[PDB]
Amino acid sequence: TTLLSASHKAAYDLRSDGITTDGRSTVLLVSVGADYHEGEKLAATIDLINRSNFGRVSIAVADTLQRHNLSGGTDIDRHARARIAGDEWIARNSTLLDRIDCPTNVLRWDFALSHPRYGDLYDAVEHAYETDEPYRHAIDSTIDRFIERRLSREPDVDQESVRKACRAYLLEECPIIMPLWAHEGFDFVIYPQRISAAMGRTRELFVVPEHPDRVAWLPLRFKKRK
Amino acid sequence: TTLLSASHKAAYDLRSDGITTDGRSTVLLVSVGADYHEGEKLAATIDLINRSNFGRVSIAVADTLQRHNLSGGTDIDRHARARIAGDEWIARNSTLLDRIDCPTNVLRWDFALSHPRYGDLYDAVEHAYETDEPYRHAIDSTIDRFIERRLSREPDVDQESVRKACRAYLLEECPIIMPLWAHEGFDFVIYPQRISAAMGRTRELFVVPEHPDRVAWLPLRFKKRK
């Protein structure tokens, strides 16, 4: 009963009765640069993981994916800078991740992108963005939320630079998190934010049909202790 | 270029004409404790890997599998020892694995044993050992070779204890290396020693009928440079 964060408690933002975590496969999605996947907030997340008694945990270091958010230089400098981010994130939080009782693995974003299925899965998703009206509306709207988020701070920013980047981000994220990890035998995805509209529809078209039991989204709710 | 080991050159011990490595997914199987997975020998293998221009490389640290060769205490105590060895291997040969240029991932034996398919594949292999005479022969004779090697040094050894252990090891190994990694989408497996008698039969039984294109074994040939 030795805790990793005495000051915080992480919990699943769901109806707990419908969650049986014991011995299941789960991914811990890490969008590098988020406060959520850092320090005392991340320490409580691991307390919850160990409490969950999973069978195996994949630590998805979504590093290079963040290159679409970075500004300046060539896409090479943006990519390699976003790589370093992850390089640093693993170094910073390694000792905390070692404290996951069940077997773990660190998946770097470039290793996901290089999976043999990634090819066809991207095209499947892109085609779905063209054909499926719900997905099209779900993606176009999530991009419009991200554009208005960056324009509140910086109104001088190039519109199509933000649109192209958010389209790129989402369209690259989706084939991995839903259909790939579904195929890779995962039962859940632990992320601190509740599933996006675009992610939801990806699950609906690519996961739900044949594997509605796989890669089920588990959002997080944090609270301080005493 | 800038060689990692100037003293040694590593090579695939094959008819190199038939091999197209460019863009393929491969495993670099590491039986922790072997000299081929250390120093100039390992450094030279990374050299070859970078010449080979792979799509992705999974560095399979077969650490806890080695628990079978250890003696004394409970399987739990011996597992722990074997795990620490891996912990250490990873620690000394990390800087060197960092020098593979394509995307990589470090897979640890306990995570492989944790794969959902492991269960069923173990059972398939055990069944194969019960029914397929070529396979039974391949395993039984592999163990018989190992008992001979042990007695030649330790004549007062419990032969049935070695026999039990050896059978355990071979059976634990096969479902991962051949059928699991075939499903996982690996075009090749890199090991310093040519394919086992038992390993071959596994590939013939679980890989060759549907995916002969998958998990092709690339053995290594070492040479001191001048």
CA B197-B201-B203 angle, to 5 degrees, is 115
A115 reaches B (C-beta below 8 A)? yes
Question: Which candidate, A27, A34, A12, places its Cα nearest to that of A93?
Answer: A34
Contact yes or no for B25 and A56 at CB 8 A: no
Q: Considering only residues 139 to 178 of chain B, which have any Cβ-Cβ distance to chain A shorter than 8 Å?
A: none
Distance CA B41, CA B2 (A): 16
Contact yes or no for A56 and B185 at CB 8 A: no
Disruptive mutation site among B26, B101, B106, B111 for chain A (greatest number of A CBs within 10 Å): B111
Chain A: give the shortest CA distance to residue B157, in Å. 34
B111 reaches A (C-beta below 8 A)? yes
Chain B residues near residue A105 by CB distance under 8 angstroms: 105-108, 111
**Residues comprising chain A, all counted:** 226
Contact yes or no for A103 and B116 at CB 8 A: no
- The DSSP annotation for chain B comes to ---S-SSEEEEESS-GGG---TT-EEEEEE-TT-GGGSHHHHHHHHHHHHHHT-SEEEEEE--GGGGGT--SS-HHHHHHHHHHHHHHHHHHHHHHHTT--S-EEEEEHHHHHTSTTHHHHHHHHHHHHHH-HHHHHHHHHHHHHHHHHHHTT-TT--HHHHHHHHHHHHHHHHHIIIIIHHHTT-SEEEESSPPPHHHHHHHHHHTTTT-TTSSEEEEEEEEE--
Chain B residues near residue A55 by CB distance under 8 angstroms: 114
B41: domain range? 1-226
What's the number of domains chain B is made of? 1
Chain B residues near residue A114 by CB distance under 8 angstroms: 25, 55-56, 102-103
Chain A: give the shortest CA distance to residue B160, in Å. 31
SS3 labels along B5-18: CCCEEEEECCCHHH
For residue B64, give every residue at least 6 positions away whose Cβ sits within 8 Å of its Cβ, in sequence order, or none. Answer: B79, B82, B83, B86, B108, B109, B110, B113
Question: Which candidate, A142, A116, A113, A123, places its Cα nearest to that of A201?
Answer: A142
Disruptive mutation site among B22, B28, B115 for chain A (greatest number of A CBs within 10 Å): B115
Experimental method: X-ray
Count Cβ atoms within 10 A of the Cβ of residue A197 and give its class: 0-12 exposed, 13-18 middle, 19 or more buried. middle
Q: At what angle do helices B133-151 and B197-206 cross, to 10 degrees?
A: 160
Is the separation of the CB atoms in A199 and A177 below 8 Å? yes
Contact yes or no for A111 and B55 at CB 8 A: no
Chain B residues near residue A117 by CB distance under 8 angstroms: 185
SS3 labels along chain A: CCCCCCCEEEEECCCHHHCCCCCCEEEEEEECCCHHHCHHHHHHHHHHHHHCCCCEEEEEEECHHHHHCCCCCCHHHHHHHHHHHHHHHHHHHHHHHCCCCCCEEEEEHHHHHCCCCHHHHHHHHHHHHHHCHHHHHHHHHHHHHHHHHHHHHCCCCCHHHHHHHHHHHHHHHHHHHHHHHHHCCCCEEEECCCCCHHHHHHHHHHHCCCCCCCCEEEEEEEEECC
Chain A residues near residue B102 by CB distance under 8 angstroms: 114
A102 reaches B (C-beta below 8 A)? yes
Contact yes or no for B56 and A114 at CB 8 A: yes
Is the separation of the CB atoms in B147 and B50 below 8 Å? no
Distance CA A206, CA A77 (A): 33
User: How many Cβ pairs within 8 Å bridge chains A and B?
Assistant: 45
Terminal C-alpha separation, chain A: 16
A105 reaches B (C-beta below 8 A)? yes
Chain A residue with the nearest C-alpha to that of B55? A114
